[PDB]
Design a protein around this ligand. Structure first.
Ligand SMILES: [Zn+2]
Length: 46
């Protein structure tokens, strides 16, 4: 009915790498930061 890929709780500024919503675009940035310093060995995603 109202459950699945398309549910009730999606934001236009929700991270995709990890997934984190925020009240405002500007805010998102601050978060996206964690996706800059993080220095993974290699095979992480997937
Ligand atoms: Zn993220």
């Amino acid at each position: 009915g109202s459950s699945g890929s398309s549910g009730e709780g999606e934001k236009p500024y929700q991270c995709s790498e990890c997934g984190k919503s925020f009240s405002g675009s500007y805010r998102l940035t601050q978060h996206w930061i964690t996706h800059t310093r993080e220095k993974p060995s290699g095979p992480s995603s997937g």
